[PDB]
Design a protein around this ligand. Structure first.
Ligand SMILES: Nc1ncnc2c1ncn2[C@@H]1O[C@H](COP(=O)(O)OP(=O)(O)O)[C@@H](O)[C@H]1OP(=O)(O)O
Ligand SMILES: COc1cc(Cc2cnc(N)nc2N)cc(OC)c1OC
Length: 159
């Protein structure tokens, strides 16, 4: 089962200056809940951006996609193609924009957080993959986070 998991603003922005452009602890909790115990796949640039004490993500099999054959990813495996990244019983692709594009055609689930923040797309932004007409499932009710930022969860699926 190949899933994608991401958080986006309503406009589709998922990154600005290499950062998620909001603060949402409750989305961090949701991300852990969906991924824990499973394989996670990320691009090398995403791995390299993480603080040393936060990688590998604990409790999950970490897979890093790279074209650098000598890359050292302490506590993870490094694969040189997407095919080899998707052989576990359940895999969550966790970023970045490049790897989400690559994996989209293979995915049969998406777990999306939509953040109700009016960030128009700007030069340099990273953008979410586009969900086409093949997907179905639940668009959850809006909730206020503890700070007052509104968010809701999509749980979509397809054959
Ligand atoms: N088909 C593929 N096979 C192998 N590695 C790939 C790949 N597509 C993407 N990548 C890797 O994933 C990196 C992209 O990571 P990312 O998706 O986290 O980045 P971005 O956040 O900038 O979209 C690529 O630069 C490449 O890693 P290297 O720079 O180390 O070579
Ligand atoms: C690459 O590692 C991480 C990536 C993210 C981005 C992310 C954040 N929120 C959601 N819903 N999905 C995502 N993929 C969130 C993370 O922790 C909350 C990660 O662990 C360090």
């Amino acid at each position: 089962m190949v899933g994608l998991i991401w958080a986006q603003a309503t406009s589709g922005v998922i990154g600005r200056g290499g950062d998620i452009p909001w603060r949402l602890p409750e989305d961090q909790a949701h991300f852990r809940e969906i991924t824990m115990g499973h394989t996670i796949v990320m691009g090398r640039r995403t791995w390299d951006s993480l603080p040393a004490k936060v990688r590998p993500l604990p409790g999950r099999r970490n897979v890093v996609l790279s074209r650098q054959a000598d890359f050292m990813a302490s506590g993870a495996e490094v694969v040189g193609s997407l095919e080899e990244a998707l052989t576990s019983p359940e895999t969550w692709v966790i970023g970045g924009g490049q790897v989400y594009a690559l994996a989209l055609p293979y995915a049969t689930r998406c777990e999306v957080t939509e953040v109700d923040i009016g960030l128009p797309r700007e030069a340099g932004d990273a953008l979410a993959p586009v969900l086409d007409e093949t997907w179905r499932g639940e668009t959850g009710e809006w909730r206020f986070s503890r700070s007052g930022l509104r968010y809701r969860l999509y749980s979509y699926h397809r054959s």
